[PDB]
Symmetry: D2
Subunit: 444 residues, 4 copies
């Protein structure tokens, strides 16, 4: 296989950029895919019962044509994200509809409109080739990716690229995603691989880390400062765990909300101390399908003050949505910020505007990250200030099982997938920094 | 009669500060009041049928003792605000409860805990006396007021005083309000009277103007810039009218939402061109009492785009609340801001968070104004850039009727009240500036 | 003649995108150029004495190869900027040095390293062709350009593209500038032509207008709000004029500093009332080569308060640098902003830091504009809110003379150049909007 | 002796508020003072040879009358600051001039125009009395102070009180400062004492700590975020030490500049790893009296990049002024911030504006702190996140000597003074939090 020659070049210690340029490209690559004819195979069934092992295929697919500003990457490792799982169960809607509609725009966008969809929105690996107009990345460069795909033809994004109107999430609204031996990305998705991490560790933070960085640290989100009290929902999950790391690393105090004592112990292993178990507390913020219970908002706030010395939180890091959002608005301090990047329990939010207007509060929407924020989030990983949260790794063959585990919230850490890497534990080229941070790296 | 002597000194050309200091203070003053014994007067009645003319009394009341950082003001004119009307009908609760509870804190706070409540949250007049520790205002200074009363003992308010935790609205959570011949205020409520306006015109903008300035113009609100498209609900009302003025004056484009062709004509008089009549279009944002119709959100946004050349608004100036808020979040441009200072149709807001998070929008809460913002809003009036919106003036003795007219939304402009001023049209000391802006000044009449 | 057919398609009513696609491309085009061999023809002479008519040639040059993300544009008109002039006299260094060094990066960048340099940093015209990966612009589209050329490969610029580390100014640090019949630009430089303007009018605002917009209006600069007092140096020049327009249209008060009464009347024609003639007042901010005179700073501050009723400016719009910068820091209000985008009188600034730190002031640097800011500036032109300032127009063959006119500031409006346009007055397709604004459009002629 | 009774109540475990209220006030108190008669006792003498042990007297002085919004505090400990030292040598002017001029305003301000000046701008102690209008503080409350005295009569300060125009620094532009047994402060200067610190430790951070907080952490300064690179001049001094602490505790990376290997070891003791010894490197930023050397600027930039892996600093924490400011502007990253609160080496700054405008940098002035910022900085001390930096402690009698040590930079840590406290080590009320942090608390000695 030409593929074997690529992997052998990576696993050797020695290959120079010209050696990568001179390698023959394979004529196919192994990829985890969805099949267009199966869009409706889950109809009438409840979301919890839909089994991603039944919809995810392991196929050999041809390589796509490389366009300007793009790179073909040999993928050593990837990860499973929530968006991958939703895609794998054809929810909220099949991902093919957008591929087909976008494909009408031009021959280039038509490349993605195929009868199969290669999924995955994280990656760590090695650049094999770059298209026209690219100078900043070369064959051989070790990379991770962020998943924002923006064209930047509209002016709207030129003061923060999340404002670009023509926006796709790579591996979700794009083909040729990361759960595969090769991937196609824009070069403005590439970031330098942290050298103290293995391939699977380096591929794990991207999507959730960068989302939490924009949402909590950056000026485009909550603009955290040291001393702040931060209420963090779901603090042991992917997102919430990065939020907790950001709160502690920036000199602030996270108030961690979890659902079980073992999740509380995960929060403690990250160094949090104020942890609220909402299952043990029994918060019922909604008394109806339609009405909430302000008494319970107030009980949450009192609990928070037990940990803060009577202070209300400066920031709420929201993403459960409707179930918690009314409480989040109520408990926030006068002048404070509720920052939201998801609505996992429901997107129709309801809140008492008296608390927001009369106390000068603010609800700020945030959505993954611009290239600078993604670079900054990954830089904090590379400096050893933020650590990966891997809790289990699967082989590419096993991605269906991996997706299930995420679907059923089976692990608290990230679930990684080896793609071309033949085993865990490869890729580290800074052993000193890794030794410095080893216990934290392995905490999950 | 000591009060007559005070009025005479004001109406005379040329009373000096020492003259005001030498005037004897009367032992009572006439005030529009509520009586503690009547707070249950409107029980079991619909808010529509509650008549302020039955609750508001014209009483002679003694002068309060003057505390540090305070001023006694001879009031020439005041205005009726929504908070005055709500107070006059004992909604959502009687103002007496807060007066009593707050009065426990100290002898100074107990001054306000009386069996009567003098209302009013705007004023224009002349300083008569100042308490201990005051250097910036003197007897004889011509003043308007803003209605934020903050103690500033807590550090919280020292980077924007709206964050002060111990905050009262003068005339609502305080006694000795402006609908009366005299009033007591903190000196950090005083602002210089605009010289081209009459007393009743000068007392007219304070509350709603300053609220709209913070909400739309200042960096603590939406931070308007020229070129922005701004959707303004209820654009002929007091608040919305000031918002429209600020949009135009700042070089932005207001998209005015009104309920009637008459109100649309009012918006045209202010200089607006893009006007949507929600009754002509018949928007139904709510299907149930529980479920909204996104088709109608979309129909609104289409209408807006007809006026803007395909563009979505950078800013939504919200204050109707539940009825409109969903639509407001939906139509806002990617990266845009919904700024809210009230929920007049109801405070339980419901919106689709997908539009907010996925399009990076924000909802910013605002509430009247810090002293700097209130100074800036009044300064724009004094420079002739923003104009009062008086539509009708009453005598102090008929304040009840004034309240009723506000209760029933009878005029689009502010409703003013003469207090000590014997007639309308007095108090102008810059006739040149007045002449330059006279037509705009009178547009709401 | 293939170029003639291109022009005829443009001048005709109604050529469609497919017609432009079908036109044969010429094998050369006429262009104003510098010649690499001549870069020392001014060595050892005073900058004032260097004649651009002696260095600017009119050549037939081959067409460049079109790369990804680029457009070939048929250019109807352009403009002379200060960077064009500095280029034409090989100052501070010859433009060829950078073209050569940058040409070593890739074959694409190597396209610009030629023995001739086609200058020009503004354009108005019609898209002929687009390179690989372009969906937003098509043959036939009427365009103006902004001059920022950024690759956006670094993450640095993805929260404001002015932070990109690899940026070039088109027509100064790139070849194939706008003073020619054809030009090559990135498609992320293209903006829609304002339809009420002629070709030469539409080409004139771009560089200076976008710079002034970022500097004064945007949150990345001074973040103007209505009511602000703004000191504007050189208020009749190219940058100063747009700043004056922005201050007025945003509801603020420009304090216009000029050097002659003729310029003062230009400012009055733009609507400004508070105007200071630095030559009439005789300001000498510098005592000698090394020390300033704070008494003159203070005399300027007193003159400003004569126009503001005792208020110090919220914002100083700086671009003269050393001669004025100490004064600008001094006169700024407590908490105010000095925003700076040039140092035309000298770049070693000297100021008294006591005033900056003890009064919580800030100095903010600004440099042309990101694509969103350039779009917003051009959008305000298209809306009729900001007007072009054309004072004179030359034919492409006369570009040398035109450079000279700018070298010696013979005019205060912009100097435009026709390129393919055979005469002035062509290109208007919104006659009603032009008619509404015609007096202001022509105010500078 | 009434003063002994006050001390005994403090040293007692359990005096209640009513007990402090019942204590008789003494008719005099011991105070470190300057005497008006001796203003010109150092004339023609170089600031180095001026001795504060000659000009500082220890006197018995009557108690001032307590005004509205004020507290009389029994002072257990204080601190020597740079402003104290400048005062003690009558530089740049004698403190008495302002005291007299301000004393001309009212009888309250005339309280401070006395033939003696009690100095001191930090305090830790116990409230004895409060004046009219004070609810938030009571006799018995354990307090530290910040030194901003603002009247807040102007609107200007009501969105950040550092913008107040009528602003004095307590103990410098005010009498009855902290180097004494009793002091008079506005109650809006009072903050809760950190319970894990001794009296002398609690009095030490106030001024320099709040200044560094506003300058580096708050949005009114540089707005630090984790990951930032921060160049910190004078990193072992009073200001620079707190700045290093904030940089580390906020997740940023301080690049600490010091002048000697011993100071470098101090920075290591605070937890910093990247340390440049300006005297080991021998930086010569100025060639002569009037011109600088960009090669030295660049050499500093390259040394910084050795520690950051080739990244330039996001923030420069400036306060040496003229000697370093040019370099500071140059080394700052594109889009970065230079934040300045002093000019100890000279206030006429000279920098090359090309680097500031073409790379979109900003210079932000900062000055001590508003009450919210001072509260936040003291809160970080109370939470155990920022630690006092006491290096040496004197008795009130030795205050003269203390000033001298600070005048000659004898000590890197803050220099503290016991006032009423009989000895060191007293006042700790949270022994477990102290035990948790004891190594850090004592790191400077
Ligand atoms: Cl594509
Ligand atoms: Cl009170
Ligand atoms: Cl190029
Ligand atoms: Cl000044
Ligand atoms: Cl005083």
């Amino acid at each position: 296989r030409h593929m074997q020659e690529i992997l052998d070049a990576i696993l050797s210690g020695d290959a120079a950029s010209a050696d990568y340029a001179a390698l023959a490209l394979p004529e196919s690559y192994r990829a985890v895919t969805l099949h267009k004819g199966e869009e409706r195979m889950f109809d009438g069934l409840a979301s919890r019962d839909k089994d991603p092992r039944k919809s995810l295929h392991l196929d050999d697919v041809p390589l796509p044509e490389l366009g300007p500003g793009e790179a073909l990457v040999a993928v050593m490792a990837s990860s499973v994200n929530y968006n991958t799982v939703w895609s794998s169960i054809f929810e909220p809607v099949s991902t093919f509809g957008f591929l087909e509609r976008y494909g009408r725009l031009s021959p280039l966008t038509a490349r993605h409109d195929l009868p199969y969809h290669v999924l995955g929105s994280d990656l760590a690996g090695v650049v094999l080739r770059t298209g026209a107009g690219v100078n900043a990345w070369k064959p051989g460069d070790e990379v991770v990716a962020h998943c924002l795909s923006v064209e930047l033809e509209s002016p709207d994004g030129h003061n923060d690229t999340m404002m670009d109107p023509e926006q796709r999430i790579w591996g979700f609204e794009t083909n040729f995603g990361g759960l595969a031996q090769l991937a196609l990305v824009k070069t403005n998705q590439l970031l330098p691989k942290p050298k103290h991490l293995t391939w699977e560790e380096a591929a794990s933070p991207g999507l959730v880390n960068s989302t939490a960085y924009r949402q909590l640290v950056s000026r485009n989100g909550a603009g955290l400062k040291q001393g702040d009290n931060v209420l963090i929902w779901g603090a042991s999950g992917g997102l919430g765990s990065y939020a907790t790391q950001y709160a502690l690393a920036g000199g602030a105090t996270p108030i961690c909300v979890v659902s079980s004592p073992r999740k509380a112990d995960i929060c403690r292993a990250m160094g949090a101390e104020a942890i609220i178990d909402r299952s043990a507390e029994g918060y019922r913020f909604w008394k109806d399908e339609h009405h909430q219970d302000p008494r319970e908002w107030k009980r949450l706030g009192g609990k928070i003050r037990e940990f803060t010395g009577g202070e209300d939180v400066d920031i709420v890091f929201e993403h459960p949505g409707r179930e918690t959002f009314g409480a989040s608005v109520y408990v926030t301090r006068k002048g404070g910020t509720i920052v939201t990047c998801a609505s996992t329990s429901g997107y129709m939010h309801q809140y008492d505007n008296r608390y927001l207007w009369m106390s000068l509060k603010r609800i700020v929407g945030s959505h993954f990250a611009n290239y600078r924020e993604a670079f900054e989030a990954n830089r904090l990983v590379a400096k050893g200030k933020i650590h990966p949260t891997l809790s289990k790794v699967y082989a590419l063959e096993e991605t269906g099982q991996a997706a299930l585990d995420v679907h059923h919230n089976k692990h608290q850490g990230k679930v990684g997938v080896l793609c071309l890497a033949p085993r865990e534990g490869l890729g580290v080229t800074d052993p000193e920094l890794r030794s410095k941070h080893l216990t934290k790296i392995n905490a999950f």
